[PDB]
């Protein structure tokens, strides 16, 4: 699971499996990769485990952006991309702010869009930030789990219906040649 | 996780969260559905677990179907279908023969699709049987991870890419107005 919280002017995620293998990839590649889109290195773990710790009770909080003025600015590194994001304090810090359905990053594909080095700026009173209801009208245009659990069944519906019309008209042409 | 066994002539699908709801279900309406695709009656729970026991230790063994001859006869309505399923030893029983991605139900969708009331049998010497080569081309056709995550990425791109063409398109519109 993961939780944002404000700790001073600090944005801090909680991680909560077999939580080890964090800790296992930060001490062989001082990085981690946390819910597929998160990209966090060893000097942002706030909370690095004792060498004894039970992992049960350990949660994983992790330096995720600086709150200046009314925006929370993620580092790019955070999420794989070059431009820095800002998220106004009115976006409410979850998940799908960053990720859409199938750990879709959302700013990892914008960015790639973007033609220009500025940074991503989302909400706000801030002239060339995407309004928040721009930005809220994207979330609910991305795919979510029932246009995904839609398009598996009628993937599966149309490669079921194509076997069974592919045997009848085989079999009609065959019968075709038949008096029975 | 679920794992098939063969015990005697009775097919078992053992079952490994808080496992509780399980037993929770089947005290509440006598029936559990296990991976969004089984159902299963409490008459089919082999193991019945104690008032004081621990469910970090316990695993829920079902009969899921029987071994006759050379054929698994699952009953259709562990399947929520009116047919019944029958798998020749040859095919390995997973999750897979049974459930595509996003856990869609292989044989709920086919036997919706099929006119007649007679069984589903795959793979074996039976004459009615949907061959073994004919099955398998089946499963891999049905989408996987990587087809559902292009799809999802794909989507978002799309959606992305509209926001950002209109924007342009806007603006040039605008501009044919403008001097600078």
Redesign the interface.
């Given at each position: 699971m993961l939780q944002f919280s404000f700790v001073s002017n600090d944005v801090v995620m909680t991680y909560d499996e077999q939580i080890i293998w964090v800790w296992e990839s930060l001490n062989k590649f001082q990085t981690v990769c946390i819910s597929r889109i998160f990209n966090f290195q060893l000097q942002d773990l706030r909370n690095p485990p004792s060498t004894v710790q039970d992992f049960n009770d350990y949660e994983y909080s992790f330096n995720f952006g600086t709150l200046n003025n009314e925006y929370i600015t993620v580092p790019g590194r955070i999420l794989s991309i070059n431009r820095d994001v800002l998220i106004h304090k009115s976006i409410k810090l979850e998940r799908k702010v960053f990720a859409?359905?199938?750990?879709?990053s959302?700013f990892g594909?914008?960015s790639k869009?973007?033609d220009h080095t500025n940074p991503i700026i989302i909400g706000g009173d801030k002239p060339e930030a995407i309004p928040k209801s721009?930005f809220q009208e994207?979330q609910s245009?991305?795919?979510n789990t029932g246009?995904?659990?839609r398009?598996?069944?009628a993937?599966?519906?149309a490669?079921?219906?194509g076997?069974?019309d592919g045997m009848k008209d085989a079999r009609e042409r065959y019968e075709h040649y038949l008096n029975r």
């Open positions: 859409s359905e199938r750990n879709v959302i594909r914008l869009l973007l721009v994207l245009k991305f795919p246009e995904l659990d398009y598996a069944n993937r599966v519906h490669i079921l219906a076997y069974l």
